[PDB]
């Protein structure tokens, strides 16, 4: 709900190949840096179950190449949180026929950014299942 | 790499007409990259930018037409021109390549305008509403960003506007609500009504259900009425289906029982509890410190054990680690198991899904459970604090030290005794600072001088101009105080112990030098550093010169009134003022609708039982939400029989005028409406100071001998006084006595011979004897030394 | 007033990080001459001015600590014949060009400023 504060996918690097705050009110290049280095170089490619940073929900993962992201507010359940970010890499992975790598990621952008807008607008989840998408998309 | 140029440059790409979609969805794509990652750049290249791409839009290149969105996509609050498209947009309106229209649409929104905002109109109104779930949705999303802007727009729409929002698909049914998020944030009666429809169907979208719940929940806090069944049937709901969420959204609020329900309710949750215990929500963390609140009932506690210790044992699971310290905490602890987790601790901490944040917080809820209290344990602690360690206590001292002083904690002796041994050998200047700045205050009020001091010069011991130079400073507060002993010695001590080392030497010469400077005592001085409550009403009414009479206020309302019920746009709370000549019925206030403001306004009374009728005043103006004055003055009739209670029928009047709040207009016209004005009634309480006698005996009788009028009843149904008791107490507001007020639950016969003195001076009596022989018949006695109070009493105390 | 003037002068020109107040204190002396040997209003406006911008600064943020102030004595410090001058500065605790100078010198905007422009 208009709950996004970015989501990204971060490079373990620290770096950050995508990042759309869908929705954001702190701003800054630079720290939207800073804010990663704290966590990221913290969480440094580990994750965690769950984490809470900030009383808001970090529901952020890493794959096998690639961190993920979600920075949202715990002021919203895990169950379905969580689900969003499951379907991120579960439809990627089918639908390419291959989820997330650092390659992957340097062959094309474009079909993330696809995806992405299609599953989430800004602080609200359009949606969050893979199947829906799979049929209405057709790249 | 990014960088603008190229593309720029680039564009010139555009003038082929071969061209593949995918080469130029790259180039696209290039650009788009730039700014994922981020880019900056000017309005005319933009807008340049748009021209150039707008120029190429022959084609239906499918993959052309979503390309564009996102472009365009990517300008939305921070835009450039709308017009452009709008052909396009239209072209898919009246175009079934269905897909694409949803999209386009959905970004204008935040870039919107009004005029432009009447495009759309009639068929939008279709559109949302229109056909497959999935066109619809792409409806939805727009408005929210022109919700930002506005949405009003739409809203007005609603009467008609809501029923559509009728569902049919899950998803899509969870998403009609929010945008009821701020339907209902526009209304809560709409609501009510409404649940029962929410209420009466079950629904879909467990996605659904959990923001009726914040809501659900949030309108239970103060009570969301007769929960019992709906809460029940909600109970249910939350609690079973395939959908776990629910459950335990409802659990961690619900709990109840404070000498409170923990009925069915504590089992449930004991079968999630359980059931979670190991992370099938991790969530299950967070809500023991708060969300599911715990500080327990005694029984109840000992219960809690084995659920913390699976955690307490387990280590691990951020979520896990979390949840240790919570439930720990929350149950308690016994001392011993202490000892067993400190060495637990003891590894666990520094990092162990990195313990030592969550520890932090943890400690952070130690000093506060015991901020140098239990100080055994403080100093089980301190010792321990200090010794597992890492470094990281520093941060924790922060707060530590913070606690102590919280409590102000008087194991001081011992505390002190820990801190200062310690912290000597366990260093960190940077405490010395915080505490030095404490203790600094505290000196001699805690003696123990020799210790004290024996500290204070070790503390200097250590190098530094600036450790040198806290002992000193701190020592202001406690010199000056001196203590045990130290007053001469104080005096003798600055010189046994002194100091070169220039600026150093300077300090102590300095500080002697300061010391030189002022009388020693002087020194350390400046371093270191009726005509009742209701009159003064009388005289705050004062400032005002309408009057028509006053006088001095006597006594005020036993009761503000609300003229104008609950929350209403022209709220009313009124106070009544008695003087020994006028009452004064002032009127306080919060013309309530940002509608209004209210103008020509003055206050209607009219009289049943007298008052001498002089003005009614009113504010001039009252905007919303902020007292203005009003007014109504009468004179107040003494010796009359009926003569100051009364009650004045109220209208109020005014023109009405309507505002802009952005930025208003005030001007002369505007037009009346009345409306009505709430019953003034006036009391003999407003008026009277309630007394004990100056003379009882003889006055008692002698209130009889002028003035005494009397009533009988004799009372056959009910054989108590308490109906006639509450009447009589709480009308006149009078003290019941010689020694005759006191009843128990019970009590054979009563009498209270009842006091105070009436306004405009004279007094007035009261004695009722209530006479049980088992029928009630009594004698109800009203004696006065004012005349229009007897009759008053007999009538009043009804 | 040479040495006056020097100070300010060096003042001017650093502007890096420091910590002195005790500097202060360390030219003043038990008395000292000042202005032209007095200018009342004027010279507690004189007052206002050099000592505000040290103060304007001061009022500003900080980064590492400098020192922590315990400048009460600073109070009188800033504001027979012995005795009447003493008076004079608890009263206290040209005169209006002086005054107008320290205004334009009100330096934590001064810092603002150049940050803003860096940006």
């Given at each position: 709900?208009?709950?996004?504060?970015?989501?990204?996918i971060?490079?373990?690097d620290?770096?950050?190949?995508?990042?759309?705050?869908?929705?954001?009110?702190?701003?800054?290049?630079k720290?939207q840096?800073a804010?990663?280095k704290?966590?990221?170089?913290?969480?440094?490619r580990?994750?965690?179950e769950?984490?809470?940073?900030?009383?808001?929900?970090?529901?952020?993962?890493?794959?096998?190449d690639?961190?993920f992201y979600?920075?949202?507010?715990?002021?919203?359940?895990?169950?379905?949180?969580?689900?969003?970010?499951?379907?991120?890499?579960?439809?990627?992975?089918?639908?390419?026929?291959?989820?997330?790598?650092?390659?992957?990621?340097?062959?094309?952008?474009?079909?993330?950014?696809?995806?992405?807008?299609?599953?989430?607008?800004?602080?609200?989840?359009?949606?969050?299942?893979?199947?829906?998408?799979?049929?209405?998309?057709?790249? | 790499?990014?960088?603008k140029?190229?593309?720029?440059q680039?564009?010139?790409?555009?003038?082929e007409?071969?061209?593949?979609?995918?080469?130029?969805?790259?180039?696209?794509?290039?650009i788009?990259?730039?700014?994922?990652?981020?880019?900056?750049?000017?309005?005319?290249?933009?807008?340049?930018?748009?021209?150039?791409?707008?120029?190429?839009?022959?084609?239906?290149?499918?993959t052309?037409?979503?390309?564009?969105?996102?472009?365009?996509?990517?300008?939305?609050?921070?835009a450039?021109?709308?017009?452009?498209?709008?052909?396009?947009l239209?072209?898919?309106?009246?175009?079934?390549?269905?897909?694409?229209?949803?999209?386009?649409?959905?970004?204008?929104?935040?870039?919107?305008?009004?005029?432009?905002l009447?495009?759309?109109?009639?068929?939008?109104?279709?559109?949302?509403?229109?056909?497959?779930?999935?066109?619809?949705?792409?409806?939805?999303?727009s408005?929210?960003?022109?919700?930002?802007?506005?949405?009003?727009?739409?809203?007005?729409?609603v009467?008609e506007?809501?029923?559509?929002?009728?569902?049919?698909?899950?998803?899509?049914?969870?998403?009609?609500?929010?945008?009821?998020?701020?339907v209902?944030?526009?209304?809560?009666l709409?609501?009510?009504?409404?649940?029962?429809?929410?209420?009466?169907?079950?629904?879909?979208?467990?996605?659904?259900?959990?923001?009726?719940?914040?809501?659900?929940?949030?309108?239970?806090?103060?009570?969301?009425?007769?929960?019992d069944?709906?809460?029940?049937?909600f109970i249910?709901?939350?609690?079973?289906?395939?959908?776990?969420?629910?459950?335990?959204?409802?659990?961690?609020?619900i709990?109840?029982?404070?000498?409170?329900?923990?009925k069915?309710?504590?089992?449930?949750?004991?079968?999630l509890?359980?059931?979670?215990?190991?992370?099938?929500?991790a969530?299950?963390?967070?809500?023991?410190?708060?969300?599911?609140?715990?500080?327990?009932?005694?029984?109840?506690?000992?219960?809690?054990?084995?659920?913390?210790?699976?955690?307490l044992v387990?280590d691990?699971?951020?979520s896990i680690?979390t949840?240790?310290i919570?439930?720990?905490?929350?149950?308690?602890?016994?001392?011993?198991?202490?000892?067993?987790?400190?060495?637990?601790?003891?590894?666990?901490?520094?990092?162990?899904?990195?313990?030592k944040?969550?520890?932090?917080q943890?400690?952070?809820?130690?000093?506060?459970?015991?901020?140098?209290k239990?100080?055994?344990?403080?100093?089980?602690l301190?010792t321990?604090?200090?010794?597992?360690?890492?470094f990281?206590?520093?941060?924790?001292?922060?707060?530590?030290?913070?606690?102590?002083?919280?409590?102000?904690?008087?194991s001081?002796?011992?505390?002190?005794?820990?801190?200062?041994?310690?912290?000597?050998?366990?260093?960190?200047?940077?405490?010395?600072?915080?505490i030095?700045?404490?203790?600094?205050?505290?000196?001699?009020k805690?003696?123990?001088?020799?210790?004290?001091?024996r500290?204070?010069y070790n503390?200097?011991?250590?190098?530094?101009?600036?450790?040198?130079?806290?002992?000193?400073?701190?020592?202001?507060?406690?010199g000056?105080?001196?203590?045990?002993?130290?007053?001469?010695?104080?005096?003798?001590?600055?010189?046994?112990?002194?100091d070169?080392?220039?600026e150093?030497?300077?300090?102590a010469?300095?500080?002697?030098?300061?010391?030189?400077?002022?009388?020693?005592?002087?020194?350390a001085?400046?371093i270191?550093?009726?005509?009742?409550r209701?009159?003064?009403?009388?005289?705050?009414l004062?400032?005002?010169?309408?009057?028509?009479?006053?006088?001095?206020?006597?006594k005020?309302?036993?009761?503000?009134?609300?003229?104008?019920?609950?929350?209403?746009?022209?709220?009313?709370?009124?106070?009544?003022?008695?003087?020994?000549?006028?009452?004064?019925?002032?009127?306080?206030?919060?013309?309530t609708?940002?509608?209004?403001?209210?103008?020509?306004?003055?206050?209607q009374?009219?009289?049943?039982?007298?008052?001498?009728?002089?003005?009614?005043?009113?504010?001039?103006?009252?905007?919303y939400?902020?007292?203005?004055?009003?007014?109504?003055?009468?004179?107040?009739p003494?010796?009359d029989?009926?003569?100051?209670?009364?009650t004045?029928?109220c209208?109020?009047?005014?023109?009405?005028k309507?505002?802009?709040?952005?930025?208003?207009?005030?001007?002369?016209?505007?037009?009346?409406?009345?409306?009505?004005?709430?019953?003034?009634?006036?009391?003999?309480?407003?008026?009277?100071?309630?007394?004990?006698?100056?003379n009882?005996?003889?006055?008692?009788?002698?209130?009889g001998?002028?003035?005494?009028?009397?009533?009988?009843?004799?009372l056959?149904?009910?054989?108590?006084?308490?109906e006639?008791?509450?009447?009589?107490?709480?009308?006149?507001?009078?003290?019941?006595?010689?020694?005759?007020?006191?009843?128990?639950?019970?009590?054979?016969?009563?009498?209270?011979?009842?006091?105070?003195?009436?306004?405009g001076?004279?007094?007035?009596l009261v004695?009722?004897?209530?006479?049980l022989?088992?029928?009630?018949?009594?004698?109800?006695?009203?004696?006065?030394?004012?005349?229009?109070?007897?009759?008053?009493?007999?009538?009043?105390?009804? | 007033?040479?040495?006056?003037?020097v100070?300010?002068?060096v003042?001017?020109?650093?502007?890096?990080?420091?910590?002195?107040?005790?500097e202060?204190?360390?030219?003043a002396?038990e008395l000292?001459?000042?202005?032209?040997i007095?200018?009342?209003?004027?010279?507690?406006?004189?007052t206002?001015?050099?000592?505000?911008?040290?103060?304007?600064?001061?009022?500003?943020?900080?980064?590492?600590?400098?020192?922590?102030?315990?400048?009460?004595?600073?109070?009188?410090?800033?504001?027979?014949?012995?005795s009447?001058?003493?008076?004079l500065?608890?009263?206290?605790?040209?005169?209006?060009?002086?005054?107008?100078?320290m205004?334009?010198?009100?330096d934590?905007?001064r810092?603002?400023?150049?940050?803003?422009?860096?940006?």
């Open positions: 709900l208009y709950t996004v504060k970015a989501i990204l971060l490079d373990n620290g770096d950050r190949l995508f990042a759309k705050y869908y929705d954001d009110t702190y701003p800054s290049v720290e840096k804010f990663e704290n966590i990221f170089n913290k969480t440094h580990t994750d965690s769950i984490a809470l940073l900030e009383g808001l929900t970090v529901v952020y993962k890493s794959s096998i690639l961190y979600v920075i949202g507010s715990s002021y919203e359940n895990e169950l379905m949180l969580m689900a969003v970010l499951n379907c991120l890499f579960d439809s990627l992975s089918q639908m390419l026929r291959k989820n997330v790598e650092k390659r992957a990621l340097l062959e094309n952008m474009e079909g993330l950014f696809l995806a992405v807008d299609e599953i989430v607008d800004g602080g609200v989840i359009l949606e969050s299942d893979p199947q829906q998408v799979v049929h209405r998309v057709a790249l | 790499h990014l960088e140029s190229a593309v720029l680039e564009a010139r790409v555009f003038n007409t071969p061209i593949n979609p995918r080469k130029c969805a790259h180039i696209l794509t290039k788009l990259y730039l700014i994922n990652q981020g880019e900056h750049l000017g309005t005319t290249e933009a807008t340049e930018a748009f021209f150039a791409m707008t120029k190429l839009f022959q084609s239906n290149d499918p052309l037409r979503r390309m564009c969105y996102l472009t365009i996509k990517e300008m939305s609050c921070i450039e021109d709308v017009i452009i498209v709008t052909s396009s239209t072209k898919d309106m009246t175009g079934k390549e269905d897909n694409y229209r949803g999209p386009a649409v959905r970004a204008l929104c935040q870039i919107t305008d009004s005029t432009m009447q495009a759309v109109e009639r068929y939008m109104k279709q559109a949302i509403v229109d056909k497959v779930p999935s066109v619809s949705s792409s409806a939805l999303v408005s929210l960003h022109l919700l930002k802007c506005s949405f009003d727009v739409v809203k007005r729409w009467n506007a809501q029923e559509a929002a009728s569902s049919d698909n899950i998803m899509v049914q969870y998403h009609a609500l929010g945008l009821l998020y701020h209902r944030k526009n209304d809560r709409a609501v009510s009504k409404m649940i029962s429809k929410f209420t009466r169907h079950g629904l879909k979208s467990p996605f659904a259900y959990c923001m009726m719940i914040r809501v659900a929940s949030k309108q239970l806090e103060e009570e969301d009425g007769s929960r069944s709906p809460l029940f049937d249910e709901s939350c609690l079973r289906n395939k959908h776990e969420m629910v459950v335990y959204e409802a659990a961690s609020a709990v109840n029982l404070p000498g409170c329900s923990a069915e309710l504590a089992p449930a949750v004991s079968v509890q359980l059931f979670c215990s190991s992370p099938k929500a969530l299950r963390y967070a809500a023991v410190r708060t969300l599911n609140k715990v500080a327990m009932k005694h029984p109840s506690a000992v219960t809690a054990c084995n659920l913390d210790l699976e955690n387990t691990s699971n951020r680690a949840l240790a919570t439930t720990l905490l929350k149950t308690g602890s016994e001392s011993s198991i202490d000892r067993l987790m400190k060495q637990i601790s003891s590894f666990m901490s520094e990092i162990s899904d990195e313990f944040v969550v520890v932090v943890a400690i952070s809820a130690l000093c506060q459970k015991y901020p140098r239990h100080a055994v344990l403080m100093n089980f301190f321990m604090l200090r010794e597992e360690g890492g990281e206590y520093k941060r924790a001292i922060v707060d530590c030290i913070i606690s102590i002083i919280e409590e102000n904690s008087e001081k002796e011992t505390g002190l005794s820990h801190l200062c041994e310690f912290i000597e050998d366990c260093e960190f200047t940077v405490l010395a600072t915080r030095l700045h404490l203790l600094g205050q505290e000196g001699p805690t003696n123990n001088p020799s210790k004290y001091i500290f204070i503390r200097v011991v250590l190098e530094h101009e600036e450790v040198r130079a806290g002992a000193v400073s701190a020592l202001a507060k406690f000056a105080q001196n203590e045990e002993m130290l007053p001469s010695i104080l005096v003798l001590l600055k010189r046994c112990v002194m070169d080392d220039n150093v030497r300077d300090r010469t300095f500080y002697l030098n300061v010391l030189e400077q002022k009388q020693k005592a002087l020194n001085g400046y270191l550093n009726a005509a009742t209701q009159e003064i009403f009388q005289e705050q004062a400032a005002v010169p309408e009057f028509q009479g006053l006088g001095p206020l006597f005020s309302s036993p009761e503000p009134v609300a003229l104008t019920e609950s929350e209403t746009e022209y709220v009313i709370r009124c106070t009544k003022h008695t003087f020994s000549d006028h009452l004064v019925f002032q009127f306080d206030c919060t013309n609708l940002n509608d209004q403001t209210l103008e020509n306004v003055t206050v009374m009219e009289p049943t039982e007298a008052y001498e009728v002089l003005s009614y005043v009113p504010a001039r103006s009252l905007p939400n902020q007292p203005g004055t009003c007014y109504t003055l009468v004179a107040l003494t010796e029989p009926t003569a100051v209670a009364c004045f029928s209208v109020m009047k005014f023109t009405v309507d505002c802009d709040p952005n930025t208003g207009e005030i001007d002369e016209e505007g037009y009346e409406d009345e409306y009505v004005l709430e019953d003034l009634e006036v009391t003999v309480a407003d008026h009277i100071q309630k007394v004990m006698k100056v009882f005996e003889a006055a008692w009788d002698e209130v001998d002028e003035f005494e009028k009397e009533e009988t009843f004799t056959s149904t009910i054989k108590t006084l308490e006639a008791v509450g009447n009589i107490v709480k009308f006149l507001g009078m003290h019941p006595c010689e020694r005759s007020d006191k009843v128990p639950e019970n009590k054979n016969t009563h009498t209270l011979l009842l006091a105070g003195v009436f306004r001076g004279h007094d007035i004695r009722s004897r209530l006479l022989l088992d029928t009630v018949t009594m004698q109800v006695t009203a004696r006065s030394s004012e005349e229009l109070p007897v009759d008053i009493i007999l009538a009043s105390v009804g | 007033e040479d040495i006056q003037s100070m300010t002068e003042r001017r020109s650093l502007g890096e990080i420091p910590i002195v107040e005790s202060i204190k360390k030219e002396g000292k001459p000042e202005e032209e007095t200018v009342g209003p004027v010279q507690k406006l004189v206002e001015m050099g000592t505000y911008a040290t103060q304007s600064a001061l009022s500003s943020s900080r980064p590492t600590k400098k020192e922590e102030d315990r400048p009460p004595l600073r109070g009188f410090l800033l504001d027979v014949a012995a009447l001058a003493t008076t500065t608890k009263i206290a605790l040209f005169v209006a060009e002086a005054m107008l100078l205004a334009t010198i009100l934590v905007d810092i603002s400023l150049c940050l803003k422009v860096l940006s």
